[model samples]
Target chain A: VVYIMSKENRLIPKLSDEEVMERHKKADENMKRVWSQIIQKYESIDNQGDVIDLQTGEVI
Target chain B: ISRMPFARLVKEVTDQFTLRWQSMAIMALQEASEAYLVGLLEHTNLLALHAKRITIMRKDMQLARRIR
Candidate 1:
């Protein structure tokens, strides 16, 4: 958990679920939006036919 | 993604000068768009948490890109 103090000098628990949701409730929706392009970006990566790039594990 | 230090990561990738003991890291980062991309959003909580906020907004992701 990455706790940071807010303006009131109170500790902000990084794990707070109430705050966790501001984005999570509609997770089904958000993920779909973010996933499309990056997936394309990832696949466009080419390494090599008998070779592999370790970081991405892709071949050219 | 592996959380291992970058220096350690390079060690795992190469050998001799040509390499040696070899450290380690994770793959699957560039396999395609679906799995890892689906997997990427899990970080939002941490990004939200970093700012002491809960509700993830596009700005949070926008900010995360630099920090992440």
Candidate 2:
């Protein structure tokens, strides 16, 4: 999860109607992938459930 | 939530490490976050209006987070 230029912050396509649609699609796909992983992991008390901290990977 | 925070959070694994970011990436991040915020505010103002308040209170944001 080191996707960054600094300690903070950091996509697109199309022409008018096609532009936002294309770019938003790209972002949507990215979110789907990201959320899929997160939900798969955290949504499972079966696995990463009860997680406490990311820095220390703590368990609660 | 500012997208910068999320953008920074975009990658936090041993793999996919990167030293630089593209302009488009930031823009996309901002755009996505802006939409979320805009949507959150819509609900927030509605709550405030219902409360008949003149200004949005901190409580509005607190509830908006959950509502969003």
Candidate 3:
């Protein structure tokens, strides 16, 4: 269990470690898809996926 | 929000890029970050209420972000 501050500055019990871990698994799965969309959006705006070596002036 | 010391943190990140930053730009970034953090917490609080829970949890945060 963990503690967090409430609206009235009261300390409250939060999620247990096991439940947090389970939630993390689901969160990670969701983030994978969400992150993909984020990347896709960025790529749509900046279509060049190549990374250029700033020092060497070569696309890597 | 004002006590977040984001100025120092922002400088730390900016220093890695070897770039000069304006004070207003740093303040803007700090303000935006704090704003986003508060907005996320506000949503998290609502999600906790929906589940009849007084305490915000990781699940609530996850649900909030997912719904957003």
Candidate 4:
């Protein structure tokens, strides 16, 4: 499991590579998009944590 | 139903029961992981720490039976 820091400042568990590819296509997309958003949000905040929109997130 | 021997009936029932039991076991394992993620439970000594409540309930029942 890839443990990532969530927007809520909590450790969020991540799925495996094959499972990630299989179950959560949208999350993968969101992860990429969220990363870009985080970079833009905090330009100088090096090592920005993981950010996910949990309310609209989907996982199979 | 009466045509089946008692031993055969037991075997068939056990086989069917095991299918559901296995599914629940897998569900519990999945729930434990989910609970840990949500911060409602924690993993300790390779076991679900939240399950201690159930253990205490069982112990209370055992103690009550012993007292009676």
Candidate 5:
């Protein structure tokens, strides 16, 4: 069980290991696509040599 | 209905680019966002435990996000 806390409340949720693993995989792919699109959009706009690495928060 | 406020923010941000969101689209986004958030929190807790701490700190959350 995982304890999820809020400002005034907390929840003890029973999450299966398999479920969490699968969801993390899904989220990782989603973030990858989102960051790729962000890079594409900004690079198209500025035509700059350095682009922001979404994961690292650094210019590359 | 959960996380509708965050979904609305997503709609507002998209609207800036002259985009329109269907109701279903917002619902899907909300669910996906919540799932990702919960998963991150779960991992953050584990990180805290690994660090020999019971309380999760902001650094733990940040580190969890950077982890694969």
Candidate 6:
């Protein structure tokens, strides 16, 4: 099922089924493509902190 | 004769965002609207327009954005 992804807390909003489908349809396709690129670039790092070059190579 | 649409009486319970996250939510919406209104306010000589837009947009967006 689709969900309304909130950027604020990185949490999915409790959208009604219709609302979810509507937003999923209206969501900027380009933005979704960009997100895919972002995940692909960053997903290899097991720890997000390591991706940021944190001291302990851990993501807190 | 046409009657004006009556204002619907509504009572809304006030709910605050989670204490742990309230500040962050407020700050994010505040900054977002402020950034959008910055140049528009300065250029048009319409401070009220700027202020109104930011106030309304922030309130409306936060209602949806805040953690419930």
Supply DockQ values for each candidate. 0.07, 0.02, 0.03, 0.02, 0.03, 0.02
Candidate 3 per-residue lDDT over residues A14-38, each given as its tens digit = 7655664565456556545655664
Question: Which candidate do you rate higher for lDDT, 1 or 3?
Answer: 3
Specify the poorest-scoring 10-residue window by lDDT in model 1 chain B. Answer: B22-31
User: Per-residue lDDT of B1-68 in model 1, one digit per residue for the tens?
Assistant: 33346456556666545644422113333233344345445566456665666556787666655653
Candidate 6 clashing pairs, residues 3+ apart or interchain: none
Give the best candidate by lDDT: 5
Kindly list the per-residue Cα lDDT of model 5 for residues A1-60, writing each as its tens digit: 466544335444444667556655776687667656644654462444557879997766
Docking class of 1: incorrect
Model 3: lDDT of residue A28: 51
Q: Across residues A1-60, which tens digit of lDDT does each residue of candidate 6 receive? A: 543434343334354646544543444353445456545554555523344447876554
Of the two candidates 5 and 6, the one with more favorable DockQ, higher being better, is: 5
Specify the poorest-scoring 10-residue window by lDDT in model 2 chain B.
B11-20
Model 5 interface CAPRI class: incorrect
Better of 3 and 6 by DockQ: 3
lDDT of 2 by residue, B1-68 (tens): 65556666665531365455565555555555565566556556555544445367789879867743
Give one digit per residue, the lDDT tens place, for model 4 in B1-57. 132353354457678755333433333444443433332111121121122221224
Task: Give chain B TM-scores in order.
Answer: 0.37, 0.66, 0.73, 0.26, 0.80, 0.29
Error of 6 at B40 (Å): 2.1
Clashing pairs in 4: none
Q: What is the TM-score of chain A alone in each candidate?
A: 0.26, 0.40, 0.38, 0.32, 0.49, 0.29
Write down the TM-score of model 6's second chain: 0.29
Rank candidates, TM-score, best first: 5, 3, 2, 1, 6, 4
Q: Candidate 6 A-chain TM?
A: 0.29
Point to the candidate with the largest TM-score: 5
Please provide, for model 1 over A1-60, each residue's C-alpha lDDT reduced to its tens digit, 9 standing for 90 to 100.
Answer: 677775456677655667565555455466665566545544453421266778997663
Report each candidate's C-alpha RMSD, comma-separated, in the order given.
13.0, 19.2, 11.9, 22.3, 14.1, 19.6
